[PDB]
Design an enzyme around this catalytic site. Structure first.
Site, mmCIF file in Angstrom:
data_model
loop_
_atom_site.group_PDB
_atom_site.id
_atom_site.type_symbol
_atom_site.label_atom_id
_atom_site.label_comp_id
_atom_site.label_asym_id
_atom_site.label_seq_id
_atom_site.Cartn_x
_atom_site.Cartn_y
_atom_site.Cartn_z
ATOM 1 N N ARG A 11 1.512 4.713 0.663
ATOM 2 C CA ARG A 11 1.080 5.894 1.775
ATOM 3 C C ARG A 11 1.583 7.336 0.956
ATOM 4 O O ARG A 11 2.537 7.690 1.524
ATOM 5 C CB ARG A 11 1.253 5.709 2.992
ATOM 6 C CG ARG A 11 0.541 4.488 3.633
ATOM 7 C CD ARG A 11 -0.949 4.848 3.789
ATOM 8 N NE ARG A 11 -1.219 6.166 4.270
ATOM 9 C CZ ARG A 11 -1.137 6.148 5.770
ATOM 10 N NH1 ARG A 11 -0.955 5.412 6.463
ATOM 11 N NH2 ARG A 11 -1.223 7.646 6.217
ATOM 12 N N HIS A 30 -12.124 5.849 8.776
ATOM 13 C CA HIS A 30 -11.358 5.845 9.660
ATOM 14 C C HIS A 30 -11.797 6.400 10.974
ATOM 15 O O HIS A 30 -12.579 7.505 10.842
ATOM 16 C CB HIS A 30 -9.892 6.335 9.568
ATOM 17 C CG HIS A 30 -9.299 5.308 8.479
ATOM 18 N ND1 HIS A 30 -9.290 5.560 7.040
ATOM 19 C CD2 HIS A 30 -8.012 4.603 8.479
ATOM 20 C CE1 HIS A 30 -8.602 4.642 6.312
ATOM 21 N NE2 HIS A 30 -7.749 4.264 7.321
ATOM 22 N N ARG A 61 -6.884 -8.307 12.937
ATOM 23 C CA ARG A 61 -6.160 -8.526 11.886
ATOM 24 C C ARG A 61 -5.959 -9.892 11.355
ATOM 25 O O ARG A 61 -5.636 -10.103 10.169
ATOM 26 C CB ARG A 61 -4.853 -7.727 12.167
ATOM 27 C CG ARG A 61 -5.046 -6.147 12.617
ATOM 28 C CD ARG A 61 -3.633 -5.731 12.767
ATOM 29 N NE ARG A 61 -3.574 -4.485 13.348
ATOM 30 C CZ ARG A 61 -3.734 -3.293 12.571
ATOM 31 N NH1 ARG A 61 -3.513 -3.443 11.164
ATOM 32 N NH2 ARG A 61 -3.929 -1.938 12.948
ATOM 33 N N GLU A 109 0.846 -1.166 0.217
ATOM 34 C CA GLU A 109 0.036 0.090 -0.165
ATOM 35 C C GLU A 109 0.936 1.318 -0.058
ATOM 36 O O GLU A 109 1.859 1.231 0.926
ATOM 37 C CB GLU A 109 -0.759 -0.081 1.143
ATOM 38 C CG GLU A 109 -1.550 1.338 1.331
ATOM 39 C CD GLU A 109 -2.439 1.536 2.700
ATOM 40 O OE1 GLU A 109 -2.095 1.063 3.750
ATOM 41 O OE2 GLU A 109 -3.607 2.046 2.505
ATOM 42 N N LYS A 142 -14.243 -0.263 3.551
ATOM 43 C CA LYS A 142 -13.162 -0.534 4.412
ATOM 44 C C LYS A 142 -13.527 0.252 5.719
ATOM 45 O O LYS A 142 -13.633 1.557 5.695
ATOM 46 C CB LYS A 142 -11.700 -0.114 3.978
ATOM 47 C CG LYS A 142 -10.648 -0.154 4.869
ATOM 48 C CD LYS A 142 -9.389 0.327 4.534
ATOM 49 C CE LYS A 142 -8.367 0.149 5.434
ATOM 50 N NZ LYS A 142 -7.255 0.807 4.916
#
EC number: 4.2.1.10
Lengths: 219, 219
Positions: free
Chosen positions: A30, A116, A180, A28, A142
């Site tokens: 960032r 988030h 996770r 990913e 997500k």
């Protein structure tokens, strides 16, 4: 369970090499943590990842959601989304959702629409709402939210089942570490790992998660 | 979560040594798997465990739920329950529930009321009902059922939340292996581990669980 590793642009080649050799499936990017966010600089990072056989998630986290200001984020999303396997766009960035869906769809790529919350695991209607909206905008919803207890973890995982479908679930913090690993049986398709010995609260080192995945999940 | 290790009589003292040095909290005496069920042979074992500073779970599984026929079973129960920290009796053994509760109750000990299904994960109402029944008999309800998909694991864990309280949850098989670790956040107070190698699908070595517990459940 696909394993993703977030990386900024420092020591990219070495970090990418470690990520590939240790079993990561995704890197990913960032971009909000990059020292350079120019179009070709980010594009190059995308290609490097692909050349190593891994997939990419293009992320440019807005300040509201824990990232930082990236002046050309709209340009980056619109122009590099078709070149990334997944593009992570915040649900709150409403103006880009439709645009990015059309662009990625035409390119045969996928959208991850995220939410988030670094303070708490929101009430159940919010959890469901975020999932619904993510699905209606055509992406993989997500949810990454701070767990303030083990119950928050159980709640997020179970309530998310009420909005059936592919998704990404993360309970942040020490309490949510188990999410996770276990999120997978609840429908979470991607999990995130720290490259080396991970040492932010709740994180699991890539090498450890790879071992865990073969141990718990049957082929 | 407390980690328990099921042990037959074979090399009892040596295996109790390993279980203790390795981090186990409890030793589950699978008397239905013992060669000598005589009161004192069993009352001696129960005492060996305690001298090593670990707890006990008295189990005489019935053939219906995986165990064997044990003549002096009751004797063993009525006479040894007050000496074991825990006693595991099947929900199906209706006759013993009441008096076994009274015994362990007077003795300040605990009862675990179990249910096994080596075939599949029953419908939601049955998961809820077994839990309710365990509670109304004054014990720690325990459910161990075979998972035939990852979805079965999620369903067992999530539905069990609907009957709040201390319990023991186990999705047997390779699909449900994650439940032996994640069950804790759903209220499962005890997990079972094989002393050494996983001799059956889904089992997790004691040493592996002690480490996993430290990693995931510091808080």
């Amino acid at each position: 369970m696909l394993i993703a590793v977030p990386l900024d642009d420092t020591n990219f080649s070495e970090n990418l090499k470690k990520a590939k050799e240790k079993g990561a499936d995704i890197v990913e990017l960032r971009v909000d943590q990059f020292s350079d966010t120019s179009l070709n600089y980010v594009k190059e990072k995308l290609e490097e990842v692909h050349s190593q056989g891994l997939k990419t998630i293009l992320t440019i986290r807005s300040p509201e959601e824990g990232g930082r200001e990236v002046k050309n984020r709209e340009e980056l999303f619109e122009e590099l989304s078709p070149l990334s396997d997944y593009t992570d766009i915040e649900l709150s960035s409403r103006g880009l959702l439709v645009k990015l869906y059309n662009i990625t769809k035409e390119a045969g790529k996928k959208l991850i629409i995220s939410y988030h919350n670094f303070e708490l695991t929101p009430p159940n209607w919010i959890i469901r709402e975020v999932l619904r909206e993510g699905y209606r905008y055509g992406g993989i919803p997500k949810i990454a939210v701070k767990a303030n207890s083990y119950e928050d973890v159980a709640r997020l995982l179970c309530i998310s089942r009420q909005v059936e479908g592919e998704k990404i679930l993360i309970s942040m913090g020490d309490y949510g570490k188990i999410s996770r690993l276990a999120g997978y049986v609840f429908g979470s398709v991607i999990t995130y790992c720290s490259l080396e010995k991970a040492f932010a609260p709740g994180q699991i080192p890539l090498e450890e998660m790879v071992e865990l995945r073969k141990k718990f999940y049957r082929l």
